[PDB]
Amino acid sequence: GAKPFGEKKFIEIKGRRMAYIDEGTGDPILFQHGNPTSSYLWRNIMPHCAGLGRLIACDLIGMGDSDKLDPSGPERYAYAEHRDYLDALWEALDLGDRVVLVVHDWGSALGFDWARRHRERVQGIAYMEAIAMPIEWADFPEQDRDLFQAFRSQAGEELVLQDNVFVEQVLPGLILRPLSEAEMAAYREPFLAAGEARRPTLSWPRQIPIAGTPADVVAIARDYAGWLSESPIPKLFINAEPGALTTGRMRDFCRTWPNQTEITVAGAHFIQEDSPDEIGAAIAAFVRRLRPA
């Protein structure tokens, strides 16, 4: 379906208005999108968890219905800045101490890091196509390797700010089934205007911890990777076939993580658009196990 889940709420964070879905009651099930997506990514997955908790999906700053940072530029929307806003938002939402995180892409880097820093409050972690550790270019899927190298070059601004390549090329190219007009409209909406409106979708690929750069994100991801590899917190690994980012070495590494259940769904990177019911059913089952009666 193309219809969103629930309706957007807003809250002021560091003076900027952030958007989020917050439906239902009980301990949170916290769904975090990555690039270049929004809370809309989870719209067909969150229904599966009806009744099981407070279903929350925030729009990262500069994304979805969340405000843009102004003045924007190449120094804006780095990992650390997103983390500042998201940490503050999650604090404001009064999540309590039994949170289930459901994460993807940069939502996984942010949620894994948040989990490492707030481990006593994390009841379980479901993740898919995640940034589970620092990688090398050989680990990056071959189909888009050159494109992502170009993003991480001076060519990135034209590709993304001018031509909206992450929304219009990468996103559909990593979804196996055709998207509808309405579905694409929802993904393009935060990024209809050329220029800095699209900067989050360029800053993000520039932040991926690849070949040692940027070193701060490499350090952060090294930290949560080491922690996750030891943590007994229940995990749900939603593996994808063919998948894209969490394949090869990174998948090998994820498969080493303790207390983890794994399912495989059809999909490349944005697997929520290919297998939402399989993914939702798996998450709901995970949460029912974590929250018995």
For residue 284, which phi and psi values (nearest 5 degrees)? -60, -40
Q: Say how many CA atoms lie within 13 Å of 129 toward its Cβ.
A: 28
Positions at the binding site: 35, 106
The question of whether 105 is a catalytic residue gets the answer yes
The question of whether 104 is a catalytic residue gets the answer no
The question of whether 129 is a catalytic residue gets the answer yes
The string of DSSP letters for the chain reads: --SPSS--EEE-STTS-EEEEEESSSSEEEEE--TT--GGGGTTTGGGGTTTSEEEEEPPTTSTTSPPPSS-STTSS-HHHHHHHHHHHHHHTT--S-EEEEEEHHHHHHHHHHHHHTGGGEEEEEEEEE--S-B-GGGS-HHHHHHHHHHTSTTHIIIIIIT-HIIIIIHHHT-SSPPPHHHHHHHHGGG-SSSGGGHHHHHHHHHS-BTTBSHHHHHHHHHHHHHHTT--S-EEEEEEEE-SSSSHHHHHHHTT-SSEEEEEEEESS-GGGT-HHHHHHHHHHHHHHHS--
Catalytic position from the list 23, 27, 129, 274: 129
With 0-12 / 13-18 / 19 or more C-beta atoms within 10 angstroms meaning exposed / middle / buried, residue 133 is: buried
Catalytic position from the list 269, 273, 274, 278: 269
Enumerate domains of the chain plus CATH numbers.
Answer: 1-293 (3.40.50.1820)
Positions at the binding site for chloride: 35, 106
CA proximity to 254, closest of 78, 155, 145, 135 = 135
Catalytic position from the list 67, 105, 273, 274: 105
Contact 112, 130 (CB under 8 A): yes
